[PDB]
Design a protein around this ligand. Structure first.
Ligand SMILES: *[C@@H]1O[C@H](CO)[C@@H](O)[C@H](O)[C@H]1NC(C)=O
Ligand SMILES: *[C@@H]1O[C@H](CO)[C@@H](O)[C@H](O)[C@H]1NC(C)=O
Ligand SMILES: *[C@@H]1O[C@H](CO)[C@@H](O)[C@H](O)[C@H]1NC(C)=O
Ligand SMILES: *[C@@H]1O[C@H](CO)[C@@H](O)[C@H](O)[C@H]1NC(C)=O
Ligand SMILES: *[C@@H]1O[C@H](CO)[C@@H](O)[C@H](O)[C@H]1NC(C)=O
Ligand SMILES: *[C@@H]1O[C@H](CO)[C@@H](O)[C@H](O)[C@H]1NC(C)=O
Ligand SMILES: *[C@@H]1O[C@H](CO)[C@@H](O)[C@H](O)[C@H]1NC(C)=O
Ligand SMILES: *[C@@H]1O[C@H](CO)[C@@H](O)[C@H](O)[C@H]1NC(C)=O
Ligand SMILES: *[C@@H]1O[C@H](CO)[C@@H](O)[C@H](O)[C@H]1NC(C)=O
Lengths: 488, 488, 488
């Protein structure tokens, strides 16, 4: 009569890496890294994005004639923009604090256009000026949301205009200053030399003077237009005054909604979907702590790591080979009912089994360790990504270094944690079998002999009741002791 | 006669968490996280703070008439400032590079005030200007550290003034420029149109021109005052020149004491206690390495972590179940001297005893582990807190991201380290008791029988000396060899 | 006959550290921290650095007459600059966006000077101006790369000049503006009052006006010169227009070679040596994953840490004390050909031995462990170092805190890794010894007699062949069953 102690084997081919060994085959393993996406630009939480197309943010806000589909935009989840958009400032020039405006737009999620300075209030000036650089069907035209003020007859009176913010929320207002190319242009347009543009609010006070100089021709013109912006608080007034060279606004943008959005640089087009995490390469759907798709993401994206594989072992070391022997020379292939167990062979018959308590304890411990690895990762809405001008390179380098350093730290953490946990799991699984063997030996004592392969041979003829007794942990030594002596 | 080996149990209810199990009761534990404070603001290292009250930094430095209690301030340890102070710039305007000034103030103490340009030197101008914005007792007044120069009679000559820094340290100087509301006011005050203000040092060169424009009324006025500041090096000269619109300084601030300080944003007052660490919610008096009261802190203080429980296990599991059995069926409450020990039952009596060597070894190891975890964290004077303007949102976001990332990293590190160390300790203890059992078994050999519960049964008569020898490592096996053979 | 199981010992003094113990003497160790340099400034990958001597970047680019040895420089790997260079701006003044220019130079490895505006083209002005501040041999002189335009006769016509970038790469152009002291100087030099300097490209539009004011004398002059720089893209035109106070450029710097570089702040001199990693104190020659020489490296260098000692244990603990005993009493000094082995004393002499499979497995495990710890850290060209102005203190503090936090995190990670792995390996060796002893005991069974010191005493007479069979896992129990049963 024999009883053996051993573990379970199967036909798995998964491998994990420990700190002491490489490419160790295991019976059960879990991949905790997702590497797949659907390659589609999709709607986030049921709200479609704002597809700018070939239009920049400045072109959309200023009302470029080639972005006329954006004159009334609904609520959006994020903004899709191209790397080098073609339809921006049709009239050459510059935009002050452009990156700050984009950062502000990264948390807006909806706008409302309000007419604040109607084009017909300027009864002493000409408000029908246009340039060929913003042409529409071969005729001169200008930005849709702005007004160009020009002399009426041969006079340019002082132009004054004010607006009191009764809309109900904060407002964004954009104005501009025109820089001519020569004195003749200035005289033709405004009749005066030495002009100014003054803008004033409760917390803003700005005065500007045009610069007249010859410049290289961009879009055919040597002139430039410089645009500025401000945020008007509730129940506040904005004042305008100019003796020339003022591109006054006609509309203001009220911030209706507010939340978590972003500007993502892609060249794609929207297609029907419904997602939660969006990447400039596609959409994601998983539950694992890490991925390796793209650093700059938007949504419920778990964590970006610079690693190609992260597999956690939750099963046995797969040694296939097994007068059935025990755990000295490998596991068993026919015991598909659990992790650890016993094998008995008496006159009635042979058969496998499983130790329920030890298997359940190991299962609970392994599951708790896996859930501790996965569950302790703090996740928040991080629409990372910022833009800097060409006069701010130290800031850009600082941001890049910060992101790369954090990425390296988390990659190192993931790798070392996975390796160390794999080694402890594989050691603990063998310690459990050793403890089972030790407990059986201690509760059996001298009525049995050891064959050295993990099995015990019985001096006393053991029936299935005795097998259940030893497996159950209730063995009465002073019953067969007298009988076991005689045959020993 | 019997000897048994087992561990020690008590009535503790403390609970620790491991990477494999939750809610595990232990005999001893150590808390390394501070979660309490005083609720009070008081002195740091014997030096009281500077309580601004309803005053701002600019209001204190410029001499707001409502802040006259701060005309002479002794040495301070830190500055207490409200979130939205009421008494700042009584005359509406702006302050250039305000946040840089606050950052400089985060490392300065005392600020001895010296008179650089006496008010009576301006013999060719009028120095008694005032406004109803800064009104005392119903009469017009002005800032106490500045001079408002106006026309004497009907003339405003060129105003010139210089100072040489022969004080002994760096000096902070503030000057302003007036922006009127209309040309009539400019003519009434300064009699000229087309004025300028020029300030120059060996490293500075600034020229300003007034701006005349209608503006929304703040504090009843449509005019503004713009202030700028500079740091004057030792043995350096500052030159002033103005045809009009100059607010000259009368006093300069000398940096007397330099050190580690900060600005605390609180709405509370100062009470009479003393501490070596201060948080906006209260003071921390502790020696523990961590705390979770508040991120922003001033003084030498423990690190901050976003956790609610950090407990180190320093003792065995509390399994209280107890012919007395051994370690296999749980611990003993009869052991009141050590962690691992013995129990003997001879014919002269019985009782409990402790093994001093193993207990001392395990105690030293656990103390080393605790001190290694605690002492491998470096803390210094960390003044978390900085101010940013409206047009610096990207920098504020960068600062917030950096702080949050580092705090998250350290919280993760502390939690995982505590979990792993707790699991290691719980395995250390049972390894130690098993080692003691195996040592005694090897020393005793075939003179005894193993009962399967951690107890031995002797084949001879173990008196007090015999049992003491077993407890000492000096068991003389050959003495009782032949005797034990007969009984077997 | 008698066979014992033990481990190897020697006369090593090296001590490693664990989390439970300190100063543990081990047989073999491995230091993964580098602490030595050569105290020399050397050539990086065979390319010598650019030695500025006592000059600054501004003095070299502007053409300081005291920096005439740098009028034509070859390729370089990095730039060596003093903390406080003596020869910078000989004429007192400032330099707009100086730190940005230095950061740009941190990624440029060569320049090619191109003559864009020849000095003889100004046929309507005088181009022979100089000052005694930039004096050569007692005569007035000026910057070598700049032209000082001055009235010819009694006239200063409008000065116009343009350049089209057909060189083949981006070009760096520097111009300047002169600020006189009094009006008499302005009339003497330029004949006009109310002048302007206009500079314009496709993306740049700048206009400046001279400031005339009395200022403290620096280098004997109250006048100043303000310098600005720009980057001209390929096939782009720059325009200069001025009615006075223009310091025109004569040369343009074309970016010939690009790469990863930096600026080293040192007071030393280049020596005749090569290197691959360079620190301000000296070069580093190592193949290790850590160092503590200097953080401001330039090149492919190991990671910096504030650790003073990082030693991994690769061998066994040193317990040097041993008829012959086994592994309980201590280590063996005689055994030299392995880690775990035997000792046999039969009738044909005596001697030690060394198990092969166990030593091979342990050696492979430790090798994989050290390789995993070392080859997990990413090292690339990370030449660090940035400059900030006196009005950018918040940015400087931000950068410093970022670097300090990252380095503290990495130091913690390295220390924890080494401290935990040392415990793991020191327990691994003991487990291996015990497993070998248990395997021998299990395959020997009842024919032997354990003595409690790690040694098995035989019953039947066993020759060298039988012991060799025992050591090779082929001992036949049935062969000696009859003889063993008799003596037992
Ligand atoms: C492990 O297996 C992979 C293939 O699955 C192979 O690329 C790699 O080199 C192997 N590593 C070792 C150490 O054998
Ligand atoms: C702007 O409108 C609000 C509400 O209608 C009013 O209280 C406020 O006085 C107005 N502003 C001015 C400058 O009149
Ligand atoms: C006991 O553990 C469970 C998780 O298994 C946890 O939810 C519970 O809070 C713990 N008990 C206490 C008192 O916290
Ligand atoms: C300022 O005073 C110091 C001595 O206190 C003197 O050396 C220096 O020349 C003075 N400054 C000027 C501009 O004269
Ligand atoms: C027990 O060991 C101690 C060791 O200090 C020794 O002094 C004492 O004599 C020993 N007693 C016996 C009975 O062996
Ligand atoms: C370990 O050795 C170092 C010097 O090698 C010494 O400074 C330290 O105090 C020692 N520690 C202990 C616990 O002996
Ligand atoms: C500059 O040179 C390029 C190439 O020769 C030419 O295409 C371009 O038109 C030139 N610029 C101007 C303004 O003529
Ligand atoms: C650097 O170290 C290597 C050993 O790996 C040695 O061969 C070489 O000569 C050393 N070079 C210098 C410059 O010290
Ligand atoms: C082990 O060595 C013995 C010599 O005693 C030899 O007879 C046997 O074949 C060897 N076995 C193996 C597997 O090398």
């Amino acid at each position: 009569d024999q009883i053996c102690i051993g573990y379970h084997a199967n036909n798995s081919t998964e491998t994990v890496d420990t700190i002491l060994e490489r490419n160790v085959t295991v019976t059960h393993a879990k991949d905790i890294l997702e590497k797949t996406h659907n390659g589609k630009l999709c709607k986030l939480n049921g709200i479609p994005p704002l597809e700018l197309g070939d239009c920049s943010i400045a072109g959309w806000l200023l009302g470029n004639p080639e972005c006329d589909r954006l004159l009334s935009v609904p609520e959006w989840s994020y903004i899709m923009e191209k790397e080098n958009p073609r339809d921006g400032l049709c009239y050459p020039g510059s935009f002050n604090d452009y990156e700050e405006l984009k950062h502000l737009l990264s948390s807006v999620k909806h706008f409302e256009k309000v007419k604040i300075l109607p084009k017909d209030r300027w009864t002493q000036h000409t408000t029908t000026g246009g340039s060929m650089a913003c042409a529409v069907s071969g005729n001169p035209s200008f930005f849709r949301n702005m007004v160009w003020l020009t002399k009426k007859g041969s006079n340019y009176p002082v132009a004054k205009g004010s607006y009191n913010n009764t809309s109900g929320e904060q407002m964004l207002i954009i104005w501009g200053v025109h820089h001519p190319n020569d004195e003749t242009e200035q005289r033709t347009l405004y009749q005066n030399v030495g002009t100014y543009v003054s803008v004033g609010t409760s917390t803003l006070n700005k005065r500007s003077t045009p610069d007249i100089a010859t410049r290289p021709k961009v879009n055919g013109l040597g002139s430039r237009m410089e645009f500025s912006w401000t945020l008007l608080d509730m129940w506040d007034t904005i004042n305008f005054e100019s003796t020339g060279n003022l591109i006054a606004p006609e509309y203001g943008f009220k911030i209706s909604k507010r939340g978590s959005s972003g500007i993502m640089k892609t060249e794609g087009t929207l297609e029907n979907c419904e997602t939660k995490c969006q990447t400039p390469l596609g959409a994601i759907n998983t539950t694992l702590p890490f991925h390796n798709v793209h650093p700059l993401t938007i949504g419920e994206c778990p964590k970006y790591v610079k690693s190609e594989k992260l597999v956690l072992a939750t099963g046995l070391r797969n040694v296939p080979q097994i007068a059935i022997a025990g755990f000295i020379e490998g596991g068993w292939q026919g015991m598909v009912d659990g992790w650890y167990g016993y094998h008995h062979s008496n006159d009635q018959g042979s058969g496998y089994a499983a130790d329920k308590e030890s298997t359940q304890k190991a299962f609970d411990g392994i599951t708790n360790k896996v859930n501790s690895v996965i569950e302790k990762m703090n996740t928040q809405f991080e629409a990372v990504g910022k833009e800097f001008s060409n006069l701010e390179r130290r800031l850009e380098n600082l941001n890049k270094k910060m992101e790369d350093g954090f990425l390296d730290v988390w990659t190192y953490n993931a790798e070392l944690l996975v390796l160390m946990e794999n080694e402890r799991t594989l050691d603990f699984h063998d310690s459990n079998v050793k403890n089972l063997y030790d407990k059986v030996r201690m509760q059996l004592r001298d009525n049995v002999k050891e064959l050295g392969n993990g099995c015990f041979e019985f001096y006393h003829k053991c029936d299935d009741e005795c097998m259940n007794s030893v497996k159950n942990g209730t063995y009465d030594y002073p019953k067969y002791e007298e009988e076991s002596k005689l045959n020993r």
